[PDB]
Amino acid sequence: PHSHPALTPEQKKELSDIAHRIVAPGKGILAADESTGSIAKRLQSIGTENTEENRRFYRQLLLTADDRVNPCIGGVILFHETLYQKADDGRPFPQVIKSKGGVVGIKVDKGVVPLAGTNGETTTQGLDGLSERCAQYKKDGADFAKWRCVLKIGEHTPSALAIMENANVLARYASICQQNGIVPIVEPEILPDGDHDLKRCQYVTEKVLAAVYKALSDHHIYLEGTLLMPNMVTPGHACTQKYSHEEIAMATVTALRRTVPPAVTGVTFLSGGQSEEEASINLNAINKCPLLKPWALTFSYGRALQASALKAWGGKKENLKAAQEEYVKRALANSLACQGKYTPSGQAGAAASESLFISNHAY
Amino acid sequence: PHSHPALTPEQKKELSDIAHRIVAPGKGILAADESTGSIAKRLQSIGTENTEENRRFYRQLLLTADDRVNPCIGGVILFHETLYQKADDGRPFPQVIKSKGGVVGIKVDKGVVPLAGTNGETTTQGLDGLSERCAQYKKDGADFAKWRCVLKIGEHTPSALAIMENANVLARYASICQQNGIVPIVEPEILPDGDHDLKRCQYVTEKVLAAVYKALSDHHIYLEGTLLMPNMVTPGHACTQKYSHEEIAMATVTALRRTVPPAVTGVTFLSGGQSEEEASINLNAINKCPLLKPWALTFSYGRALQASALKAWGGKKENLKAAQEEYVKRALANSLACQGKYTPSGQAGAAASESLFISNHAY
Amino acid sequence: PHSHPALTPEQKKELSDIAHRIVAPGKGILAADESTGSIAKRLQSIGTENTEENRRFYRQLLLTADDRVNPCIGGVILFHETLYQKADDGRPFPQVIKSKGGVVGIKVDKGVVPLAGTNGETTTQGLDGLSERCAQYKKDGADFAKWRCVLKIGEHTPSALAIMENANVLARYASICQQNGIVPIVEPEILPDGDHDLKRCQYVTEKVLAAVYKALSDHHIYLEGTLLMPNMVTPGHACTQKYSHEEIAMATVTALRRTVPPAVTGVTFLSGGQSEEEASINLNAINKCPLLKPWALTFSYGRALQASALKAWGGKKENLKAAQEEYVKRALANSLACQGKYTPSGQAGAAASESLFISNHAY
Amino acid sequence: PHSHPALTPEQKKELSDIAHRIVAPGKGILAADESTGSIAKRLQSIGTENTEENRRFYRQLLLTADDRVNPCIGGVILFHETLYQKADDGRPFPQVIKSKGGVVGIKVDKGVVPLAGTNGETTTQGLDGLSERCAQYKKDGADFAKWRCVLKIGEHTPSALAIMENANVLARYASICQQNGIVPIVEPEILPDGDHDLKRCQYVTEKVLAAVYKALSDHHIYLEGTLLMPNMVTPGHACTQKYSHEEIAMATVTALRRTVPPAVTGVTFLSGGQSEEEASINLNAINKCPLLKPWALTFSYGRALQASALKAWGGKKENLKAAQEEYVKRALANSLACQGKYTPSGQAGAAASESLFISNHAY
């Protein structure tokens, strides 16, 4: 085939630099791009009514954590509303994040849509006018974006259709981002829903990723200016087989080594419905795996970095300092974790708390 | 692989019925879906200021044009603006069309966007919210839609990526439409620009169509509930070679016979920068080809059906009866053409166009 | 892309002529190309011992049937061995065949082989050295070839790998055949084994045949100069639900008209384990189905045209006449069948030999 | 997808072993797979009789070299002939190779063949009976095999077909090799022929490889049990611009990082028609490239290890001492190069490269 410089060296320079800053040694990502709706249940959980102000404040709470979080957070995925919201001190959220050493992020997908003829599978939308938006968001403070595609494992899923479609949508999305100076975090989120073993998930993960990487190659994407955001190869949420953090870690590292080429600046795993602690133990075990990992393996957590903070906050602004603490210890815990220097109080922190399924009540 | 009913028999029926109604023996499609910009330039030529009114009036002139066009026009491709405009008699445009026998359609795509890393190649956007749009358009009288894709022929074009991205994006649109009871008109538009000969165009057309259909198959698209709207295989507008009308017909039909499956209800050719007569005679010649054509080959002309009526209405309302008549004529001419019974034979005679390329001045 | 002619007008021409000769109105194909191991099975099934003479004679049994058979046999598929054998009169077998008005055929594949990582799926070999073998064959009076790919239905079959793999080998074999002046018969054989319903067999067929033509397109195969040899869309052999010939017919033609383009000269069906009568009644019904079929829908029968010939022969060289008459009857029956004018001398009447399963059914 | 185990843990482990030890620290591969044809030309260049004994001797010359070479060579690719040839002591070469710590290889493809409808493109055969050959070869000591696929660079080549075709064939042989305990070496040989520049050769390389790893993936190939034998990214042999060895290295490393996943044991580069010294120098700088290389980067040279050694043989059975030193010289030189420990030597001399040209010597 014939080359056609999609990006000039000048453009390629910036993309790679921005990519690195986010995943620099120890650094991670706080995914707080919860849409006004997905955050509604979060706010309701503690009794706080989903109001413009309540939202702004909670976003600020995490964002105003004292300087201890600085060496912990490399980037923060923001939501459109949040991006234009300001902190009490007059300074707008992106500027706040700026001063704290982190790269600002923004979500660009418009949600999921069903695929006719499939077993309830989906694809994601958000391309129409994405270039126009990227151009604006960039000028308004963001440098990296996030687009989420979902895939279900099951009896007949994922199908070749779901795989090939999403891979292609992510490529389109990626192509647009890089044209507007924005590092695209690609998110092939294979949901851990079902009673599938570790291998089954590993198989699917190796497959979905192998498709994604061929898609980006077709659409001429600058790999060193991207970041993968996959789910860890963990057993299906209803599996009756006991697995150790070393196994999920090994299976996750193998799958990535088999599909993600070394030119990918870094893999930012997300919490597969995992608890704050577990997420950290696993991330740590991943970084301790003897297998040569050519890329930065860090985090991009929403709940794992918020759960206790949102809880402590509990609407009571008096709790502000307490809530910010639960967040910072989590940030520190994970920053250590993404280096294999995290000690979960003696090598086994979160142990299996009454495994409802494996036990005997799942027979 | 395993089945998953994208469309129930009830839905399958409605789709094929609306499709055959449009391409009924003799009937054709009127394309009056010019964007406010495309119609603007058109109105400039006759000396008419581009306002919502003059557009509404122009669209009206064609719509309420005698009852003689009734057996000629099976459907009209409308524009968003026009779908909500009323005729002087306080009657909605989609209502005049239905009463006069035609099926109302609409343009849905939101235009073309550049694909990075290609030589000026493109793709088409419009998938965001297509379902919500098709559900409303459905409730408003429309029953079919149009999505145009552009594919330029050149040194290294069309490329694997442009052919694949466009093929796939068309297939997505068809899925959504059909889900909402709309019959999709697949439009893989290969531009007749360049000095490329006839055969080159016949090569790329087979290649484009072959891709397009595999994409429809993959997405579980009900072929019987669709229509193709390709250009006639013709030499580029800079070819210095003289081609007979019998040749255009043969290249076109051979290409379609080789790619389009029999189940495709009908092929509605577009004008392709051709004059009103030339379009009529080429459509006719195509229908007279000795080869077996398992689908209705008809017209879907915009310019080749409005050129004479348009210039015959330089804003002056008095030119009503006169202007509307040129339309009736072209409608009747093409109705004979889409049956192979159009008396105007030969090639030109006392008809011709800029022979500058097919002459010494192009050497 | 650049139009690179794979064949000249001369070569295109020859293949088209040959293909049309085989599928001419009323004419079908006698598949008499069993391997020494396949024919050996059939011999002991009637108490005959496998031998070159017994094979030669038996092949001669069919090949010399009275002249009422001439108008029925458009082509005969031979095995490598028989292509080189002579008749009792001294005339080489290809000569006798050519004297009755048929085109000579030769199987050119070297059997199926396993695809690793699949669920007992296969692919086919025989590609190595094709050009040289085909050339020899073409010279030795063989104008067309056959290549069998065996696909199969199960809860996870046929898988993408199997589908695109078998499809790609077909396009390769075809490419080589036409390059040497031999019209290739694409045999995408979906096994009738299993208890899948008609809906399942039809859904599969559409996906398979879709992949096959996209592939044939990629490899630059001249469709007009190729014949398809698919299985009739019927339910699985273990399927406990009985279907009417109209349904089998409907599903057969529907799937076909949805995937096979009109440019394909013919579709020579194979009777997957059907009795002599069934094969005829179904082929007859398929030819009476109201839907528009732009290609010849004939037969390419093996046991449907040999069950009684073998049975009546019984080894006795004296029973030859009864045996030839049996063959002639089925041929004449199918010559009509492929014209939808067959004499239903069935209604549950055709030699009851064996049914299904494996328990106590050696060979 | 659906996980159907292609290899057992035992097989996977064994393949990983065989592979890891071929590219072990400081080790490389000797290409002694010269078909009777290729080797014949090399012999004529020095004026020799192309006799089985001469071919046997010339190779015994390289195989029974002094132990200094033992640490440099991890494997030797042999032609079918040599695998069954014995050294003077009455011991087959496969054993003489195993004794010195090296692993014996074997060429299994039957050569290239043209692809109808392309611009001089080809594909490779050798799949028929490959499992049988692999099984036997595994019995004769051969632990790894080799399959060559040639890709050409031109105005419109390679084409999608060429890429997809070869990538799919390499993946076929890989699945079979691994199916018989043989570590396959996928050799995607992109020809150095042409005038294309460095950037162009790199673009193409990434594209080809990406397709090759997608194919391998679809085919369930166990990557860890395979090697990669590509050419170094270099400008066409007729290119006017001269590039620094750093540039060869840079484009080579960047290209491979972009398309070869970490899981691939190693890359064994080809001489590509370079001088013995240039091959060493280039390979040296490829290993000294500041970018992270998660895979062994060694050699798999033929003439770059045999050129001077062959010239220092002539045709008399005593120059053995001379010929051997040259082989050992080159093998030691490259052993250092594949670690970044190669002191770039000088020239100022005639050296020993290729055959005769317009340049005379006396007569």
Contact B128 A131 (CB under 8 A): no
Contact B119 A7 (CB under 8 A): no
Angle between helices D276-287 and D245-259 (to 10 degrees): 60
Distance (Å, whole) CA C327 – CA C324: 5
Contact D203 A1 (CB under 8 A): yes
Which among D214, D254, D262 has the least Cβ separation from residue A257? Answer: D262
Residue C329 Cα, gap to closest chain B Cα (Å): 33
Q: Which residues pair with D263 in a beta bridge?
A: none
Helix (H, G, I), strand (E, B) or coil at A240: coil
Breaks, C-N > 2.5 A, in chain C lie after: none
Say which amino acid occupies D86.
Answer: K
Contact C219 D160 (CB under 8 A): no
CB atoms near residue B347 (< 10 Å): 14
Task: Please say whether the beta carbons of B187 and B229 come within 8 A.
Answer: yes
Chain mean position to CA D104: 13
Method of elucidation: X-ray
Which among C3, C200, C207 has the least Cβ separation from residue B217? Answer: C207
Contact B158 C1 (CB under 8 A): yes
Helix (H, G, I), strand (E, B) or coil at D84: coil
In the numeric block, the tokens 């069954």 are attached to D84
CB atoms near residue B66 (< 10 Å): 13
Helix boundaries (H) for A84-197: 93-99, 130-139, 160-179
Helix (H, G, I), strand (E, B) or coil at A75: strand
CATH number 3.20.20.70 is the correct assignment for the domain at C1-363: yes
Chain C residues lying within 8 Å of D179, measured CB to CB: 116
Distance (Å, whole) CA C298 – CA A145: 58
List of long-range contacts for D39-45, beta carbons under 8 Å, 24+ apart: D41/D355, D42/D306, D42/D310, D42/D355, D44/D355, D45/D310, D45/D354, D45/D355, D45/D356
Distance (Å, whole) CA C294 – CA D158: 36
Task: Please say whether the beta carbons of A289 and A257 come within 8 A.
Answer: no
| Nearest residue to B190 via CA among B258, B237, B242 | B237
| Nearest residue to B151 via CA among B188, B115, B194, B119 | B188
Chain B residues lying within 8 Å of A128, measured CB to CB: 110, 125-129
Phi and psi at B325, nearest 5°, equal -70, -40
Distance (Å, whole) CA B39 – CA C217: 39
Chain A residues lying within 8 Å of B214, measured CB to CB: none
Chain mean position to CA B51: 25
Distance (Å, whole) CA C194 – CA C357: 10
Task: Please say whether the beta carbons of D305 and D247 come within 8 A.
Answer: no
Q: Output the DSSP codes for B29-88.
A: EEE----HHHHHHHHHHHT----HHHHHHHHHHHHTSTTTSTTTEEEEEE-HHHHTPEET
Angle between helices D160-179 and C198-218 (to 10 degrees): 120
Contact D117 C6 (CB under 8 A): yes
Contact A259 D210 (CB under 8 A): no
| Nearest residue to D279 via CA among D309, D310, D300, D251 | D300
Residue B200 Cα, gap to closest chain C Cα (Å): 6
Distance (Å, whole) CA C350 – CA C277: 5
The tokens of A84 are what? Answer: 């234009």
Task: Please say whether the beta carbons of B341 and B281 come within 8 A.
Answer: no
What would you measure as the largest C-alpha separation in chain B, in angstroms? 64
Q: Output the DSSP codes for C60-91.
A: HHHHT--TTSTTTEEEEEE-TTGGG-B-TTS-
Q: Output the DSSP codes for C180-197.
A: TT-EEEEEEEE---S---
Distance (Å, whole) CA C186 – CA C208: 12
Contact B263 C260 (CB under 8 A): no
Reported as type and span, the H/E element at residue B112 is strand B112-114
The half-sphere exposure of A254 on its side-chain side, counting CA atoms within 13 A, is 17
Contact C259 B261 (CB under 8 A): yes
Which among B199, B210, B262 has the least Cβ separation from residue C214? Answer: B210
Helix boundaries (H) for chain B: 9-22, 36-46, 52-63, 80-83, 93-99, 130-139, 160-179, 198-218, 245-259, 276-288, 303-311, 320-337
The tokens of B252 are what? Answer: 């076109």
Q: Identify the contact set of chain B against chain C, taking CB-CB distances under 8 A.
A: 1-3, 158, 199-200, 203-204, 206-207, 210-211, 213-214, 217-218, 223-224, 254, 257-263, 292-294
Residue A166 Cα, gap to closest chain D Cα (Å): 15
Give the resolution in Å.
Answer: 2.6
Helix (H, G, I), strand (E, B) or coil at C204: helix
Q: How far is CA D1 from CA A69, A201, A258, C117, C166, in A?
A: 41, 10, 16, 11, 18
Helix (H, G, I), strand (E, B) or coil at B301: strand
Q: Which of D125, D163, D169, D178 to probe by mutation at the C interface, max C CB count within 10 Å?
A: D125
Residue A262 Cα, gap to closest chain D Cα (Å): 5
CB atoms near residue A346 (< 10 Å): 6
CB atoms near residue D92 (< 10 Å): 17
Strands B122-124 vs B112-114: parallel, antiparallel or unpaired: antiparallel
List of long-range contacts for B249-252, beta carbons under 8 Å, 24+ apart: B249/B282, B249/B285, B249/B286, B249/B288, B249/B289, B250/B289, B250/B291, B251/B198, B251/B199, B251/B201, B251/B202, B252/B286
Radius of gyration of chain B from Cα atoms? 20
- Count H helices and E strands in chain D, helices first: 12, 12
Distance (Å, whole) CA C3 – CA B9: 42
Residue A125 Cα, gap to closest chain B Cα (Å): 6
Task: Please say whether the beta carbons of C247 and C202 come within 8 A.
Answer: no
Q: How many CB pairs under 8 A join C and D?
A: 75
Phi and psi at B277, nearest 5°, equal -70, -50
Using alpha carbons only, what angle is made at residue A315 by residues A314 and A320, rounded to the nearest 5 degrees? 80
In the numeric block, the tokens 């190309």 are attached to C33
In the numeric block, the tokens 């009455």 are attached to D90
The tokens of B60 are what? Answer: 């009206």
The half-sphere exposure of B166 on its side-chain side, counting CA atoms within 13 A, is 32
Residue D268 Cα, gap to closest chain A Cα (Å): 18
Distance (Å, whole) CA D207 – CA B161: 13
| Nearest residue to A171 via CA among A219, A228, A222, A110 | A219
Distance (Å, whole) CA A362 – CA C348: 52
Residue D165 Cα, gap to closest chain C Cα (Å): 9
CB atoms near residue A348 (< 10 Å): 11
Q: Which residue of C has its CA nearest to D123?
A: C172
Chain A residues lying within 8 Å of B172, measured CB to CB: 123, 165
DSSP collapsed to 3 states, C274-305? CCHHHHHHHHHHHHHCCCCCCCEEEEEECHHH
Distance (Å, whole) CA B7 – CA C240: 26
CB atoms near residue B338 (< 10 Å): 27
Q: Which residue of C has its CA nearest to B205?
A: C1
Chain B residues lying within 8 Å of A166, measured CB to CB: none
Breaks, C-N > 2.5 A, in chain B lie after: none
Q: How far is CA D266 from CA C238, D72, D289, in A?
A: 50, 16, 16
Task: Please say whether the beta carbons of C26 and C293 come within 8 A.
Answer: no
Distance (Å, whole) CA B280 – CA B251: 17
Task: Please say whether the beta carbons of B49 and B43 come within 8 A.
Answer: yes
Reported as type and span, the H/E element at residue D93 is helix D93-99
- Looking at residue D90, the DSSP 8-state letter turns out to be T
CB atoms near residue A99 (< 10 Å): 9
The half-sphere exposure of C83 on its side-chain side, counting CA atoms within 13 A, is 26
CA dihedral sign of residues C50, C53, C59, C65: negative
Distance (Å, whole) CA C352 – CA C349: 8
Q: Which residue of C has its CA nearest to D2?
A: C156
Distance (Å, whole) CA C297 – CA A344: 72
Chain C residues lying within 8 Å of D165, measured CB to CB: 168
Helix boundaries (H) for A183-266: 198-218, 245-259
Which among A1, A206, A211 has the least Cβ separation from residue D207? Answer: A1
Contact B165 A178 (CB under 8 A): no
Which among D3, D258, D263 has the least Cβ separation from residue A263? Answer: D258
Q: How many CB pairs under 8 A join B and C?
A: 74
| Nearest residue to D279 via CA among D206, D331, D350, D357 | D331
